[PDB]
């Protein structure tokens, strides 16, 4: 009764809100849901809880100097019939970045949050870079499907690339499969039909395309999803839709690397970046 | 001399190999600065050998069964696995001792385990067990068990440690198992270590409440000499001579009493360095006995280290040192006299595993030849720090030498000649220079002492001098 | 041999005993007995099974071989000094650090530590 | 022989305002050393006019170790003044993504390339996550000036805060210190004196404010730096005028760390956000 859900992408995308709307909307459906915010911004449950930043795991850590004295009810917070655990990064340049993940999802398989009592499990991690503890979902297999939140930027495109290729790696001991791609408009005229292409090329589909709107900082300067702030508005029938076919998703497949000069002519062919020529090199 | 035509040479050598190749042996080999104390910027050792260059190291087997375990007579040695290990291996060392074989000695003889391939498919910890019980039955005189372990029983793990250990408990007989995989380690150095720390986590634990025997101010124990052609005989002679009392010898005509008496024992010389040194540092730091280095390869050698050997005792002992000098003096002057004008002035390159090209050029130099090459197949880089002084300037040093760097770096110096193992004697002997085998003595010997240096230099003029070598080339040719 | 694996992820230090000088490395023994070390590749070149060897009965220790690899890597993590470089090139004797799939299983008690990330922090 | 490090979110033009640096610094008589930590590398495309520059990583793994790597190989100089390297990144998911840094800079120490002819070494390291090989330049003391690449996006402003952190946490370990802050424009209302207003609570200067401009497009396609394309673009002068800053700054600060609420107060008042 487990789905188990990742979340995927560079940093300054847009997922971390997509992820709170989405799971706003299997509130709606009354889905019991698990988000885990496995990002050392420590951001991912703002837009749920009404807080300033949920207290992560290493801060119970910490001014309880181990994790074994930690307890459930402080680390998992219930809002909006949903429950929020949130991970974070320890203090930046020592150690791994993802060590809290590490320090995370271990706790909490240790404290039985992770047993069957939910509908589906949600992990929000930065996927900037395929690291340990970033990576541990795909290696350990606690990640089943995984989805990429991919703007039409390069940096979106080399990061789903890279994510595919780990998921690719451990494609063969465990069942971490990509589900497939939701798109983040930036305001650009062929970002659409590229993460069309880039769905195609690597062999899945996309799930939605989300529009920018500006609702979204109404929503959040309250800290709340925009799925309770406009149920009526057309961002929260887009979220819901995306839920929709979130749920219906039936294509897991095992994605198809594309080489670094296929995304360049790929950046080239939706006219992003001008035509470059061999006999234009010198001036 | 001619330092730059001797860089010329490995220039003009090591064109031949691959990059790769030639990156890494351009690293094996150098011209000797004596005044180089650090030999690490000079030459490197202790690497692993390139792959289809025709090596001359043998294999971690080798260097624990063949070298440290084998001369030890009183204990049966167990090759655990196939039957080419042992039976290359059986007797081809002329590690000398006194006893009755396959009844209390057993140096000589060939124990294994016979493998087949349900050995290999299912485990051999059950048929080693029965060997070790079928061992007691045929040979109740034996004073203890080794089983030397082999590339298949590492590979297909089996618990070696674990029989060991129940069968010593049930028959109560000290049982020392060894893993010495031919692939572990690059070369016999790894043979030696291992064979020291099974030594050291069996044997030296296996007493340590005795006491009652009864010591001395005068008690030496003899490390690193395995009786090579008698070598540890005369060392022997030549101490008690001194007035000093020899308690344990490692290991050749070495009882497994003398092992474990070894730790009552006031002063440790240590013959050859890197095969036991390993035992010595543990030694001193455990037991505090004090070791040090002594040579016996010519006469000059040999007083120098009788006279640094009585110096750590007091005015008896050296004066007793002082009385076999003046006794042995005639002897060895008799036959420097004899043999030096026949033998002065000659060039010799030399290539033998470890210490013995550094320990024999005092006596090269003591007969009038000068070493021009010598190497290591698997000395480190403390062996080159030591070896370094004793060579004169811009001479040829080489380590893991190659069977056609050898050939060439021969055929440019054309020495007079040249001291080796088995393996190249016969691929010197058809260019016409005269070849000594520096590992078995050329069946000979010993060295050791005044009267191994007799040997040494009759040996020597024998083989340089022989009409054979004017003989080579046909006269119609 | 006996193993000792401890880690801030395990709650409790896990004690087995292993087979000394088995083809599988310590590798093999952490995966037998149900103690995840990260594993990131099968070439021994990731590094990432990065550990903290003790040898806590100082009179047996076994020497071994530091293979051009091992050593290699050692150097790409950084967890390499000069001189453990130099007492293993010459004295044939372990490092501190060591890669948990290319590490193998010697007959003594040993305690094996790990923070649960991969090798260079 | 001062050397510094480029730090930053991806994206925000590090590696091109580092080239474009670079290429200032060419000109005035000064030999200048580039390395690249991106993962993927491009820091690199601009000046040596290769299409990718063979990373020092994936040569040494063809090779079969990085002791049988040469430095010619990797040490390629497209411009006379200025020679090249890439660092390189490991596959996806196989161990650390930093120890690519690790053996560069070990093998440039090891070679010695930092010898007699150098006036400034700069790197290019990605800023968005400082742990293991990114950490690195600021703990083992290598870079003693640091630079922060940022814009007006919130990301920016953070990771800028996760380096001041870093050095802030490894401030006694050796002379790494924060030069300035250089910006980027988007095309955005009130960037530059917000940039301005972070330093100013950081305790550090605001170096330049370089914006966008259409002259790098064609510089891309090019291949080759705005100043060597276009000596006479606006932009080329401005990098120049940024450049001569970088080597006429003077103070080198301990930066102060910036808790998130402050942050969140500045992004508020100026309505980047609302
Ligand atoms: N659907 C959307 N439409 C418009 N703006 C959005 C949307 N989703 C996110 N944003 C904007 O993106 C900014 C940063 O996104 P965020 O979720 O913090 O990125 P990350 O997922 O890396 O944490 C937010 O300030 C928000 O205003
Ligand atoms: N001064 C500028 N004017 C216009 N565009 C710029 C300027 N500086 C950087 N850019 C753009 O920012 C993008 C980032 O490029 P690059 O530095 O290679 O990536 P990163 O910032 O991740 O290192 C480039 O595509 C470039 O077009
Ligand atoms: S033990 Fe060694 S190969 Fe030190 S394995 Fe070998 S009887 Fe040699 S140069 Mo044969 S390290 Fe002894 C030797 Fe020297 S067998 Fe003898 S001669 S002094
Ligand atoms: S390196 Fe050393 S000596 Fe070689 S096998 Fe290995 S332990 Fe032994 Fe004996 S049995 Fe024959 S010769 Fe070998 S192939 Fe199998
Ligand atoms: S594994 Fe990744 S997150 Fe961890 S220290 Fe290395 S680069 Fe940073
Ligand atoms: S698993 Fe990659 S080095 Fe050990
Ligand atoms: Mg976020
Ligand atoms: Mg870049």
Redesign the interface.
């Known amino acids: 009764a487990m789905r188990q859900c990742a979340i995927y992408g560079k940093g300054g995308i847009g997922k971390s809100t997509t992820t709170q709307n989405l799971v706003a909307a299997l509130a709606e459906m009354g889905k019991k849901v698990m988000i885990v915010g496995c990002d050392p911004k420590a951001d991912s449950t703002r837009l749920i809880l009404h807080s300033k930043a949920q207290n992560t795991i290493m801060e119970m850590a910490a001014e309880a100097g181990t994790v074994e004295d930690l307890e459930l009810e402080d680390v998992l917070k219930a809002g909006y019939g949903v429950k929020c655990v949130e991970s974070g990064g320890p203090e930046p340049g020592v150690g791994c970045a993802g060590r809290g993940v590490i320090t995370a999802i271990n706790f909490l398989e240790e404290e039985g949050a992770y047993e069957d009592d939910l509908d589906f499990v949600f992990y929000d991690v930065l996927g900037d870079v395929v690291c340990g503890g970033f990576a541990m979902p795909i290696r350990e297999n606690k990640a089943q499907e995984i989805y990429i939140v991919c703007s039409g930027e390069m940096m979106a495109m080399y990061a789903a690339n890279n994510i595919s290729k780990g998921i690719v790696k451990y494609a063969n001991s465990g069942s971490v499969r990509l589900g497939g791609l939701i798109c983040n408009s930036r305001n650009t005229d062929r970002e659409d039909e590229l993460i069309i292409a880039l769905a195609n090329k690597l062999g899945t589909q996309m799930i939605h395309f989300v529009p920018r709107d500006n609702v979204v900082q109404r929503a959040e300067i309250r800290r709340m999803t925009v799925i309770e702030y406009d149920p009526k508005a057309k961002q929260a029938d887009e979220y819901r839709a995306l839920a929709r076919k979130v749920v219906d998703n039936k294509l897991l497949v095992i994605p198809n690397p594309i080489t670094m000069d296929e995304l360049e002519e790929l950046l080239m062919e939706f006219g992003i970046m001008e035509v470059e020529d061999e006999s234009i090199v010198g001036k | 001399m001619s330092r730059e035509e001797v860089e010329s040479l490995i220039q003009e050598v090591l064109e031949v190999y691959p990059?790769?190749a030639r990156?890494d042996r351009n690293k094996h080999l150098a011209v000797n600065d004596p005044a180089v104390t650090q030999s690490?910027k000079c030459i490197i050792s202790?690497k692993?050998s390139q792959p289809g260059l025709m090596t001359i190291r043998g294999c971690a087997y080798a260097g624990s069964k063949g070298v440290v375990w084998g001369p030890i007579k009183d204990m049966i040695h167990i090759s655990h696995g196939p039957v080419g290990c042992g039976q290359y291996s059986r007797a081809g060392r002329r590690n000398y001792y006194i006893g009755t074989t396959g009844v209390n000695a057993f140096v000589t003889m060939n124990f294994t385990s016979d493998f087949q391939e349900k050995d290999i498919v299912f485990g051999g910890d059950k048929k080693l067990a029965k060997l070790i019980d079928e061992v007691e039955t045929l040979f109740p005189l034996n004073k203890g068990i080794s089983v030397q372990?082999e590339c298949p029983?590492?590979?297909?793990?089996?618990?070696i440690?674990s029989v060991s250990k129940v069968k010593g408990a049930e028959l109560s007989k000290t049982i020392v198992?060894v893993?010495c995989?031919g692939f572990?380690?690059?070369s016999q150095?790894?043979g030696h270590?291992?064979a020291?720390?099974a030594v050291?986590?069996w044997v030296l634990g296996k007493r340590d409440e005795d006491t009652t025997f009864a010591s001395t101010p005068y008690d030496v124990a003899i490390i690193g000499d395995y009786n090579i052609g008698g070598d540890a005989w005369s060392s022997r002679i030549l101490l008690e001579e001194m007035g000093l009392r020899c308690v344990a010898q490692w290991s050749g005509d070495g009882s497994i009493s003398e092992i474990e008496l070894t730790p009552k024992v006031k002063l440790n010389l240590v013959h050859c360095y890197r095969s036991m040194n390993?035992i010595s540092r543990?030694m001193e730091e455990?037991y505090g006995i004090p070791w040090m280095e002594y040579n016996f390869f010519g006469p000059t050698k040999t007083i120098e280290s009788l006279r640094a050997i009585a110096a750590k005792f007091d005015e008896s002992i050296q004066k007793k040192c002082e009385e076999v000098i003046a006794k042995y003096k005639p002897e060895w002057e008799a036959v420097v006299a004899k043999y030096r004008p026949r033998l002065e002035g000659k060039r010799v390159m030399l290539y033998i595993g470890g210490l013995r090209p550094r320990h024999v050029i005092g006596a090269y130099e003591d007969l009038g030849m000068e070493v021009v090459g010598t190497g290591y197949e698997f000395a480190?880089?403390?062996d080159y720090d030591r070896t370094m002084k004793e060579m004169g300037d811009s001479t040829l040093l080489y380590d893991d030498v190659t069977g056609y760097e050898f050939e060439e770096f021969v055929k440019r110096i054309k020495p007079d000649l040249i001291g080796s193992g088995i393996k190249e004697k016969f691929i010197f002997q058809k260019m016409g220079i005269p070849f000594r085998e520096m590992h078995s003595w050329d069946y000979s010997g010993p060295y050791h002492g005044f009267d191994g240096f007799a040997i040494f230099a009759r040996d020597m003029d024998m083989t340089l001098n022989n009409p054979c070598w004017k003989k080579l080339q046909a006269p119609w040719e | 041999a006996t193993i000792y694996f401890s880690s801030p992820l395990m709650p409790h230090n896990k004690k087995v005993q292993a087979v000394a000088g088995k083809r599988s490395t310590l590798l093999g023994v952490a995966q037998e007995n149900g103690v995840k070390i990260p594993f990131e590749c099968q070439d021994g070149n990731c590094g990432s099974c990065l550990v903290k060897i003790t040898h806590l009965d100082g009179e047996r220790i076994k020497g071994m071989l530091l293979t051009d690899k091992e050593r290699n890597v050692l150097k790409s993590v950084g967890k390499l000094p000069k001189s453990e470089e130099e007492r293993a090139a010459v004295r044939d004797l372990p490092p501190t650090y060591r890669l948990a799939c290319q590490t193998i299983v010697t007959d003594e008690d040993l305690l094996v530590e790990f923070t649960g990330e991969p090798g260079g922090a």
């Open positions: 990059e790769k990156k690490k202790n692993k372990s029983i590492g590979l297909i793990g089996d618990d440690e198992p893993r995989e572990r380690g690059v150095s790894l270590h291992i020291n720390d050291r986590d390993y543990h455990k480190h880089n403390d």
